[PDB]
Amino acid sequence: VNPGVVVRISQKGLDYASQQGTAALQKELKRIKIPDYSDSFKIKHLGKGHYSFYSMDIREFQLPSSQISMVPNVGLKFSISNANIKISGKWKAQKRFLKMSGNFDLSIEGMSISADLKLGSNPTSGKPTITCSSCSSHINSVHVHISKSKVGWLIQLFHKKIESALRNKMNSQVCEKVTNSVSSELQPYFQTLPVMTKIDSVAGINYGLVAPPATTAETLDVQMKGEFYSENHHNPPPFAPPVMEFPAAHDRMVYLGLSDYFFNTAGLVYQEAGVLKMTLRDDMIPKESKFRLTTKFFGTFLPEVAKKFPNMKIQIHVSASTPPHLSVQPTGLTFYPAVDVQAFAVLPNSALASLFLIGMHTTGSMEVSAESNRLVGELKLDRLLLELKHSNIGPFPVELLQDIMNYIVPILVLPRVNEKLQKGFPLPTPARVQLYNVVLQPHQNFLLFGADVVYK
Numbered sequence: 001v002n003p004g005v006v007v008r009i010s011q012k013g014l015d016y017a018s019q020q021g022t023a024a025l026q027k028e029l030k031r032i033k034i035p036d037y038s039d040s041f042k043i044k045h046l047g048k049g050h051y052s053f054y055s056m057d058i059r060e061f062q063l064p065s066s067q068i069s070m071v072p073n074v075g076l077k078f079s080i081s082n083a084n085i086k087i088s089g090k091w092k093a094q095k096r097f098l099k100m101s102g103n104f105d106l107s108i109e110g111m112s113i114s115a116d117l118k119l120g121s122n123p124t125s126g127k128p129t130i131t132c133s134s135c136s137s138h139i140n141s142v143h144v145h146i147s148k149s150k151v152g153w154l155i156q157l158f159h160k161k162i163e164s165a166l167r168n169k170m171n172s173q174v175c176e177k178v179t180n181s182v183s184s185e186l187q188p189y190f191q192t193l194p195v196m197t198k199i200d201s202v203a204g205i206n207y208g209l210v211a212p213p214a215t216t217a218e219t220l221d222v223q224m225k226g227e228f229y230s231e232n233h234h235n236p237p238p239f240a241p242p243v244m245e246f247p248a249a250h251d252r253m254v255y256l257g258l259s260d261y262f263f264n265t266a267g268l269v270y271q272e273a274g275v276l277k278m279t280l281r282d283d284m285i286p287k288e289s290k291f292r293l294t295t296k297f298f299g300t301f302l303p304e305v306a307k308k309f310p311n312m313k314i315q316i317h318v319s320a321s322t323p324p325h326l327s328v329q330p331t332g333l334t335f336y337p338a339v340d341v342q343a344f345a346v347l348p349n350s351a352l353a354s355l356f357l358i359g360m361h362t363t364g365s366m367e368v369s370a371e372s373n374r375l376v377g378e379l380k381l382d383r384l385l386l387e388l389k390h391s392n393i394g395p396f397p398v399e400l401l402q403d404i405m406n407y408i409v410p411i412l413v414l415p416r417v418n419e420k421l422q423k424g425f426p427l428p429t430p431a432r433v434q435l436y437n438v439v440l441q442p443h444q445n446f447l448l449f450g451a452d453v454v455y456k
């Protein structure tokens, strides 16, 4: 009912998908092998004989326009309205000893084809299914042309004795190619949608369908789990996805709803894996900085440090003991980072002696974009708010640490975060599809990305 991620396909997107599937189908239809047709007569050039229309080949199979119709709560209807086929072949006729022969062109006009497609999902695998439940093909007219004018009688025999058979067979071969194509090419194609999509050595994203695709008058909605996960952990997140409702729009081909839940499961997985941490040593503090990680330097501003731990190096460990939350409002995405920062003196035997522990938090904006079928981000921070948690060097006002923290964060900590946000995460795109004309509109509890698709 409430997925973590939804992909809504508009009539515009289905109009494009129709054009692409028609292109593929056109090449296969053109390969139909038309049977030879032979018969006999008692109707001159001289009474007697037999005749045959043979070695026919489809020179052109024109599919001018096609459409995909959304049938509410039923599925999709694929239709081709005014198709025309041009065929070239050989003919021969015989009456007593007279042999006649030549080439002919056949024009099949006004052919209409239609096929109903039932969309579903395999609940265990999270993969989509598409089946063809019916197909019909009809023809409006057939015209035969032969360069030799003297065989009008033979074209009349074609109409009286061959045309119906030839039309019936063509309509069946056409629906055979259509039905075969759905099972053998269409379903496997949409099954290229990713299910368990691995990002790195720590996480993956589950994009498996949690319901069968649902068709309404103006939308085809594909509901996906949309949960980041660890290949080591198994527990579901303790929070739930929000309802994501938005009006049908037709300006773009697809609409991606990325819930706040989706983003927060990413914070949960990486924090639980223990990777949201960093150790800072004095050798990592840019030469340009006045702040040095040594008890000597810290002694210039804090209490017992230089005294209690003389001429020792200091290390600052930064970590997240709780998963960082993200909220989505019409204003955009907001990130609420909370980090523990603990300072240690390095002892004569290299062991770490705790000096103090503070908590640091702020609000940050998360700008989200698209880039090569992946989502990428950039985090910017507001003022850093500090709180003293514990001290082994006596009481002191946490404000004394404001300057060093104002430097260390944007210079050394934030960049590591933004390098990873820029590397990004894969979107659920099927094979050979790329997104363009992207627009973003934040909504309450989810980000909505609208986009056009290009297939190759």
Ligand SMILES: CCCCCCCCCCCCCCCCCC(=O)OC[C@H](COP(=O)([O-])OCC[N+](C)(C)C)OC(=O)CCCCCCCCCCCCCCCCC
Residues within 6 Å of the ligand: 007, 009, 013, 014, 016, 017, 018, 020, 021, 022, 024, 025, 068, 076, 078, 119, 128, 130, 181, 182, 184, 185, 186, 187, 189, 190, 193, 213, 222, 254, 256, 427, 428, 429, 430, 433, 435, 453, 455
């Ligand atoms: C933000 C990230 C998420 C992005 C999600 C992307 C949105 C989903 C894309 C849908 C619209 C975009 C158009 C691309 C698809 C067009 C078809 C295609 O690529 O190949 C056809 C393919 C053609 O295959 P092919 O010949 O080109 O190559 C086949 C295989 N290889 C490459 C190995 C040779 O299959 C066919 O059978 C064509 C026959 C046409 C049948 C009639 C048309 C059907 C119309 C499609 C119905 C749509 C149902 C979707 C179900 C949704 C399930 C989730």
